[PDB]
Symmetry: C2
Subunit: 84 residues, 2 copies
């Protein structure tokens, strides 16, 4: 989807650098550079995805925080429909 391809990819590089196929074929110094860097992105998603949920839950409140007082107005006033 985006955060998936990215993530997926990351999982797969590690998936490589760790394969016994390169026990010594890949620079032992290099294994680091990836793994680490891959995790960097791994975490960077987990963290960004979680931070997202908040800006969501922060707009959801500051939204109804405008509606509920009018709902709880029209709902007090005669008529009262709101039930989508």
């Amino acid at each position: 989807r985006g955060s998936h391809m990215l993530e997926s990819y990351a999982f797969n590089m590690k998936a490589t650098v760790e394969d016994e196929k390169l026990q010594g074929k890949i620079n032992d110094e290099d294994k680091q550079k990836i793994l680490d860097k891959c995790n960097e992105i791994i975490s960077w998603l987990d963290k960004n995805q979680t931070a997202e949920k908040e800006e969501f839950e922060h707009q959801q409140k500051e939204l109804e925080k405008v509606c509920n007082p009018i709902i709880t107005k029209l709902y007090q006033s005669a008529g009262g429909m709101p039930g989508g």
Copy 2:
């Protein structure tokens, strides 16, 4: 996603207030303000999708910048004729 619910709410709350002659509402201002905010989210939501999008393509790039050189180095050593 909880982003849906947000959308949903914004999307419903916006139409459930445009519905029809449900003008029992202060169907003029104290409704106008339910439109502005609602859409404010409708948009801000969007501006974030295409905001996240990028950051992903970004990080996705940065990680290759740390892998391409190495996988290239790999595709250069196990031949039987090359």
